[PDB]
Design an enzyme around this catalytic site. Structure first.
Site, short mmCIF file in Angstrom:
data_model
loop_
_atom_site.label_atom_id
_atom_site.label_comp_id
_atom_site.label_asym_id
_atom_site.label_seq_id
_atom_site.Cartn_x
_atom_site.Cartn_y
_atom_site.Cartn_z
N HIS A 199 -3.85 -17.45 -32.71
CA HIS A 199 -4.47 -17.21 -34.04
C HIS A 199 -4.89 -18.49 -34.75
CE1 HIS A 199 -1.77 -13.61 -33.43
NE2 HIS A 199 -2.94 -13.04 -33.66
N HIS A 206 -0.39 -25.74 -39.82
CA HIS A 206 -1.53 -25.23 -39.12
C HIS A 206 -2.71 -25.20 -40.08
CE1 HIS A 206 0.23 -21.89 -41.31
NE2 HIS A 206 -1.03 -21.53 -41.47
N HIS A 210 -6.63 -23.10 -41.12
CA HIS A 210 -7.59 -22.02 -41.01
C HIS A 210 -8.97 -22.63 -41.19
CE1 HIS A 210 -4.28 -19.07 -41.71
NE2 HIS A 210 -3.80 -20.09 -42.39
N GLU A 238 -8.92 -20.20 -46.99
CA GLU A 238 -8.32 -18.92 -47.42
C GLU A 238 -8.34 -18.81 -48.94
OE1 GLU A 238 -4.61 -18.44 -45.02
OE2 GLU A 238 -6.04 -17.13 -43.97
N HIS A 257 -2.12 -25.69 -44.06
CA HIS A 257 -0.91 -25.11 -44.58
C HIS A 257 0.30 -25.79 -43.99
CE1 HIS A 257 -3.16 -21.14 -45.54
NE2 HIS A 257 -3.34 -22.07 -46.46
N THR A 293 -0.25 -15.31 -45.19
CA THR A 293 -1.65 -14.87 -45.08
C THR A 293 -1.99 -14.26 -43.72
OG1 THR A 293 -2.59 -16.92 -44.31
CG2 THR A 293 -2.38 -16.63 -46.74
C1 LIG Z 1 4.79 -15.03 -36.87
N1 LIG Z 1 5.80 -15.53 -37.84
C2 LIG Z 1 6.04 -17.01 -38.01
C3 LIG Z 1 5.28 -17.80 -39.10
O1 LIG Z 1 5.49 -19.00 -39.22
N2 LIG Z 1 4.50 -17.12 -39.94
C4 LIG Z 1 3.69 -17.70 -40.88
C5 LIG Z 1 3.86 -18.93 -41.55
C6 LIG Z 1 2.91 -19.32 -42.51
C7 LIG Z 1 1.83 -18.51 -42.84
S1 LIG Z 1 0.61 -18.99 -43.99
N3 LIG Z 1 -0.77 -18.79 -43.32
O2 LIG Z 1 0.72 -18.09 -45.13
O3 LIG Z 1 0.89 -20.41 -44.27
C8 LIG Z 1 1.70 -17.28 -42.17
C9 LIG Z 1 2.64 -16.89 -41.22
C10 LIG Z 1 6.61 -14.60 -38.39
C11 LIG Z 1 7.11 -14.85 -39.68
C12 LIG Z 1 7.97 -13.98 -40.32
C13 LIG Z 1 8.37 -12.81 -39.69
C14 LIG Z 1 7.88 -12.52 -38.41
C15 LIG Z 1 7.02 -13.40 -37.76
ZN LIG Z 2 -1.88 -20.44 -43.00
#
Ligand SMILES: CN(CC(=O)Nc1ccc(S(N)(=O)=O)cc1)c1ccccc1
Ligand SMILES: [Zn+2]
Length: 258
Positions: free
Chosen positions: A62, A92, A94, A104, A117, A196
């Protein structure tokens, strides 16, 4: 048929698997700069990245993540709107298919070419997985990217992307210093929001810096060479991996500056 950024699995579909998509504190949002209230009680943001220990860079299908060893009191965000101490786990970006879109958050409807982010978890919850289940679990520092002069401190990231072209490739990426990604000013807007991407959890204090960083066209062009697909699958360039602005509903955005 998992979530992504396409016509049939993109942001407008996410609510079916993740009904919180239509929740009361979703991110990102448009930052209406004239409606954001200056809050003189807001503290300067404290960004202490001197001891950050990057470990690895991962293409997760992603975006790509620069991951950090968050097992000690290193790389932490404090102050600003935050109570307590938040530890850096990953960053990371976007970005868009063209320089005119990719962020975003937007500022008075303006879209930047990309958005960084820096993701931190509240140390009172012990680790990231427990923190995301709390309404004050995460603090994400968002930084806009515009296209102009190169950002020298980004180049180490850009150069490793060829080795993680595809979903699931990782590379050792030790010793990357995220201080090289920060603009001069730490003036910010802040509001309560969400992840997000799915699962879209409403666990984030958003801190969005006013000052963008400049990256070169060549740097962002290299982001756009990444693939959403796995190796030996049909090529779909990793571009336009941004969620559009969501309804502000009953929230106030605060400014640290006049
Ligand atoms: C896939 N994931 C890990 C993770 O770091 N997620 C995450 C971390 C940051 C963001 S963002 N774009 O709002 O900065 C979006 C998603 C996850 C997080 C919580 C519960 C289940 C999976
Ligand atoms: Zn992000």
């Amino acid at each position: 048929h998992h979530w992504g950024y396409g016509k049939h699995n993109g942001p407008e579909h996410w609510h079916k698997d993740f009904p919180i998509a239509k929740g009361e504190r979703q991110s990102p949002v448009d930052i209406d700069t004239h409606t954001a209230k200056y809050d003189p009680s807001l503290k300067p943001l404290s960004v202490s990245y001197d001891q950050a220990t990057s470990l690895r860079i991962l293409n997760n299908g992603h975006a790509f993540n620069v991951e950090f060893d968050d097992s000690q009191d290193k790389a932490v965000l404090k102050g600003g709107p935050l109570d307590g101490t938040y530890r850096l786990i990953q960053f990371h970006f976007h970005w868009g298919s063209l320089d005119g879109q990719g962020s975003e958050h937007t500022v008075d409807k303006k879209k930047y070419a990309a958005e960084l982010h820096l993701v931190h978890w509240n140390t009172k919850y012990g680790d990231f997985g427990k923190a995301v289940q709390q309404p004050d679990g995460l603090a994400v520092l968002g930084i806009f990217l515009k296209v102009g002069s190169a950002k020298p401190g980004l180049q180490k990231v850009v150069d490793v992307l060829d080795s993680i072209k595809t979903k699931g490739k990782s590379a050792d990426f030790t010793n990357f210093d995220p201080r090289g990604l920060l603009p001069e000013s730490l003036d910010y807007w802040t509001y309560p929001g969400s992840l997000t991407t799915p699962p879209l959890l409403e666990c984030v204090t958003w801190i969005v810096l006013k000052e963008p960083i400049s990256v070169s066209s060549e740097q962002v062009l290299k982001f756009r060479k990444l693939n959403f697909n796995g190796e030996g699958e049909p090529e779909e360039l990793m571009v336009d991996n941004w969620r559009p602005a969501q309804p502000l509903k009953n929230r106030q955005i605060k400014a640290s500056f006049k």
